[PDB]
Structure 1
Amino acid sequence: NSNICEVCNKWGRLFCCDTCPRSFHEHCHIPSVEANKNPWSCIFCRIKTIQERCPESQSGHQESEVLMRQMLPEEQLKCEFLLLKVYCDSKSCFFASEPYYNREGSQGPQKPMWLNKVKTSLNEQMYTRVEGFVQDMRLIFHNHKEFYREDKFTRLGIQVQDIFEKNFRNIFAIQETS
């Protein structure tokens, strides 16, 4: 196994996957690393098995159809992994915890959103459809763009939204376009 956490790239108390060489801190893994289960398979392994069991699941999809999917177990897992993929980028730190807004010339968003809140919402099964999760994710970056205006810090939202969008297109096998 790896000697660092796959998500945050730090050492510490790690749980090792039994089916691949990745390791995780307890609350870096999503869902949080399960109490027992020997062997234990990580989310990367679980996502790979879904694809292997249904190869046609990688054929192209329309985003509008994906978003209307109910949050059954496999869609739940895919959203957890997409969330995890965002956390994997070090720039996710800016969006992880609850923000506050006091900048001359800006007003805070009507609906604040942050990664940890989405994480909780997933854990608590608050999304009934994929659309719920993707809306909150995109709202994080949209709020940041609007607040920071012409400050160059706005680019952090662009950057992390691009990681989110790339991984969304990959995980849910969105039909490739120009």
Structure 2
Amino acid sequence: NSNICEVCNKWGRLFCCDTCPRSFHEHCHIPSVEANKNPWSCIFCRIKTIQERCPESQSGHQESEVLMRQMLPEEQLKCEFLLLKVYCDSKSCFFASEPYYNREGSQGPQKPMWLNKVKTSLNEQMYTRVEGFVQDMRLIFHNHKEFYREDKFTRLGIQVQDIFEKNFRNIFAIQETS
């Protein structure tokens, strides 16, 4: 097994996957690493199994059909994995916890949003469709863009949104376009 957390790249109290060499902090894994379960398989391994059981699940899909999917167990898992892929980027730190807004010449967003909130919302089964999750995720980056205006700090929202969007297209097998 790896000697660092796959998500945050630090050592510590790690839980190892039984079917691949990754390791995780307890609350870095999404969902949080399960109390018992021997053997234990990480989210990466669980996502891989879905594809292997249904190879046609990798054929291209339209984003509009994906978004209307109900949050059955497989879609819940895919949204967890997508959220975890964002936490994997170190720039996710800026969007993890509850923000506050007091900058001359700017007003805060009407609906603040942050990664840990989305994580709670997933854990508590508050999203009934894929669209709910993806809307909250895109709202994080849109609020950041609007608030920071012409400050160069706006770029951090563009960068983390790009990680989100590439992983969304991969995980949900969105049809490739020009």
What is the TM-score normalised by the length of structure 1?
1.00
1:60 match? 60
User: 1:92 corresponds to which residue?
Assistant: 92
Deviations 1:81-121 (A, max 9, x none): 00000000000000000000000000000000000000000
Give identity over the alignment, percent: 100
Q: 2: distance between equivalents of 1:42 and 1:52?
A: 16
Deviations 1:11-42 (A, max 9, x none): 00000000000000000000000000000000
Q: Which runs of 5+ in 2 are unaligned?
A: none
Deviation track 1:135-169 (CA, whole Å, cap 9, x = no partner) reads 00000000000000000000000000000000000
Instruction: Give the ranges of 4+ consecutive aligned residues of structure 1 lying more than 4 Å apart after TM superposition.
Output: none
| Distance in structure 2 (CA, Å) of the matches to 1:116 and 1:45 | 23
In structure 2, what is the Cα distance between the partners aligned to 1:63 and 1:149? 29
CA distance in 2, matches of 1:140, 1:165: 13
Q: CA RMSD in A?
A: 0.1
Offset at residue 48 of structure 1 (A)? 0.1
Unaligned runs of 5+ in 1: none
State the match for 1:31 in structure 2.
Answer: 31
Q: 1:123 deviation in Å?
A: 0.1
